[PDB]
Design a protein around this ligand. Structure first.
Ligand SMILES: C[S@@+](CC[C@H](N)C(=O)[O-])C[C@H]1O[C@@H](n2cnc3c(N)ncnc32)[C@H](O)[C@@H]1O
Ligand SMILES: C[S@@+](CC[C@H](N)C(=O)[O-])C[C@H]1O[C@@H](n2cnc3c(N)ncnc32)[C@H](O)[C@@H]1O
Ligand code: SF4
Ligand code: SF4
Ligand code: FES
Ligand code: FES
Ligand SMILES: [Mg+2]
Ligand SMILES: [Mg+2]
Lengths: 383, 383
């Protein structure tokens, strides 16, 4: 693991930047973690605690205390032996993960698209501006970046941008419809080494092609999955479910397994953007139909492919993750246009205002997760 | 080494956080460093460069390019194989080293004291406020902290504060007159492991005691040096030269070597604070007298003690190092009361304003280094 401690106004989190697992630290636990990362010795850390805190603590008591949870238990086995990166703020909520909508342009114009993509916004951040943004985010401790759109790789200067992303972040993911991939793009992402690709597949050939409005789209996108996987790029396949494709999940999973994909994830079509027109919620029969196929698929393909459960490493919207639109406005979530601020016009500290987050929590209509967030009781390191 | 890249408005620096050596990166060199830290392979990095830059580059050309300087040469030997910490800003100058004046209180009242120490300021930051400050500095990439005063360890809550400093920074140094050290303070700093102590010794017994106004001060302070060294704490001895002690340098060096000190540094008395009254610049005969003793001392004791040269790891005042006074005002240098800002009232970004730094560069009367600083031509990574 590549561990970091990220400070927040109500407490700190420890993050494994590689897996993006994170763990809410108690104030005491954070202090002990920092000590162990420095002196690397349970006896030394316990004795320091005794001196500074005027409280008895032996190495056995410290070991037993940390053995109370499997993650803190690893701190007694040398997990904290590498330098622990420090980031964040006690005064504002700064993210550990961001999703950057590089452009709203797209070669498709899917009738369900939550982003209403196809045409770019009249003014979008240039690749040079996104490179400025990424330097600011990385210097603030953002560890994980997703590049989306639209079709992200349509942005002029994409190659330089994705190199900057790879260089400045622990993990990069590029979301793509899988169309119009060039050999040197595959090669570039392969060599960069920390870039994954998420490809949308919405059915077998004919259903996918109808839903996406592209005859031959499935075959091209599946070929892209194969080329990426052959170049050792982790591929995540995202299938967005509706009444047309609900019965095709198991067949799609097989195709993805054969193509070498790493992860398969199915999700509902949400009533956002172009999908609002004529929206019908997935009724219960179709939802159960998906679930039985996911279960069957794990029995069959679970060895060769991670098949995600239908509906922590979840970065809480707004508090731990930001979505940055192609026009520069920052929101808690790719589904939400209610802004925290503007990435060029406002300071990082102002964007992460706790008061605004509370306001967005009660006013957001499209991100369903943010309204459900319950902050833990304040428990800060060092008091 | 524990390497970091710190962005500035005119270019980036690579820092070894352990030794505090740093190196101005060219924009190209910074890009190559990040790539090598990620894919860890000269062939992969060269090929990525070819694809993104549309310029030919083989592994041999990359190796030859980096072999042009001994530090970049190590990047072809795996120096960059651990995660590279990113910090800084393209819009303001943020420091990599800070010196925190925890209090202006002191048990002595030396007639030369640049800080005019003895009585605390009427309002000083509490240890709790300093702990808030340290979290902000560490989250902004400050790697190295010095705790000074006054006598820093007089601050209420010193033990908790120095533990926070050790926990949040790669290196901590505590400056002390060497008086009134408790056994558990020595033990605490020993166990923390990344804390050094700088002790002032201004002559042999009688000259030191006269200059410091403390009969028995030399014997007590030398005993502290011995206790600290016996506990494996690196001790730096600082001798501040005047006409009274200039001929005692070699004798002091011997005492410091015998006591186990790590570094000996002699410096001039500067016309700041209480020393302005009756100030006489060290004339040339006394300055040469010091130099001959330093030379003799290195011949004799250079094996057992680092004897610093009379008059990079020098962190440029204001641009790379901040001094934070006990009243919270930030200045470029411990000798200078001209402020960059206030650590509680102003944002980090506002304190490091490039325009204010230029103004301080031309208006500062007491820091002699800042006026001499010449910024290199702008050479930013990623354009
Ligand atoms: C906005 S697309 C951008 C990347 C790329 N153009 C693509 O389609 O894969 C990101 C993901 O959102 C999904 N998506 C689009 N509209 C949606 C909606 N209304 N509800 C749920 N997911 C949706 C897409 O199918 C895709 O998996
Ligand atoms: C301000 S003292 C604070 C720490 C502690 N009280 C001590 O004296 O070591 C830090 C250093 O500055 C030195 N110093 C004080 N006044 C000075 C002056 N006018 N010129 C040069 N150094 C000075 C001290 O001797 C000491 O080495
Ligand atoms: S879902 Fe992806 S491919 Fe379809 S219009 Fe939206 S951005 Fe384009
Ligand atoms: S030089 Fe150090 S010991 Fe002397 S008055 Fe100043 S702060 Fe106190
Ligand atoms: S994070 Fe916005 S809906 Fe889940
Ligand atoms: S840094 Fe101020 S005088 Fe040297
Ligand atoms: Mg059908
Ligand atoms: Mg004399």
């Amino acid at each position: 693991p590549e561990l970091a401690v990220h400070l927040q106004p109500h407490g700190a989190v420890m993050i494994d930047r590689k897996s993006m697992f994170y763990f809410r630290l108690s104030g005491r636990g954070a202090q002990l973690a920092f000590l162990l990362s420095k002196n690397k010795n349970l006896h030394k850390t316990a004795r320091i605690w005794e001196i500074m805190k005027k409280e008895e603590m032996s190495a056995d008591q410290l070991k037993e205390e940390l053995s109370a949870h499997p993650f803190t238990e690893a701190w007694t086995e040398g997990l904290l032996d590498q330098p622990l990166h420090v980031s964040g703020s006690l005064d504002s909520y700064l993210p550990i993960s961001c999703t950057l909508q590089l452009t709203n342009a797209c070669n498709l114009s899917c009738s369900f698209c939550y982003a209403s993509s196809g045409k770019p916004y009249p003014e979008e951040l240039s690749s040079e501006q996104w490179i400025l943004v990424m330097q600011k985010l990385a210097a603030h401790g953002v560890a994980d970046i997703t590049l989306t759109g639209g079709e992200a790789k349509l942005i002029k200067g994409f190659k330089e941008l994705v190199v900057v992303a790879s260089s400045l972040f622990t993990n990069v993911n590029v979301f793509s419809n899988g169309l119009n991939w060039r050999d040197e793009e595959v090669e570039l992402l392969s060599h960069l080494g920390n870039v994954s690709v998420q490809i949308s597949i919405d059915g077998m050939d004919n259903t996918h092609d109808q839903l996406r409005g592209r005859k031959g789209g499935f075959k091209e996108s599946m070929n892209t999955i194969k080329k990426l996987s052959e170049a050792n790029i982790p591929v995540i396949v995202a299938m967005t479910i509706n009444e047309s494709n609900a019965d095709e999940v198991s067949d799609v999973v097989e195709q993805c397994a054969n193509a070498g994909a790493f992860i398969f994830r199915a999700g509902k079509t949400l009533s956002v953007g172009r999908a609002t027109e004529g929206f019908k919620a997935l009724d219960i029969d179709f939802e159960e139909m998906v679930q039985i196929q996911l279960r069957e698929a794990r029995h069959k393909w679970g060895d060769r492919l991670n098949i995600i459960d239908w509906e922590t490493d979840f970065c809480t919207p707004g508090y731990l993750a930001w979505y940055i639109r192609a026009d520069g406005y920052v929101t808690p979530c790719q589904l939400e246009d209610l802004p925290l601020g503007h990435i060029l016009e406002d300071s990082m500290a102002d964007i992460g205002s706790p008061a605004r987050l509370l306001q967005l929590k009660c006013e957001a209509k499209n991100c369903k997760c943010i309204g459900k967030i319950e902050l833990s009781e304040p428990d800060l390191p060092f008091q």
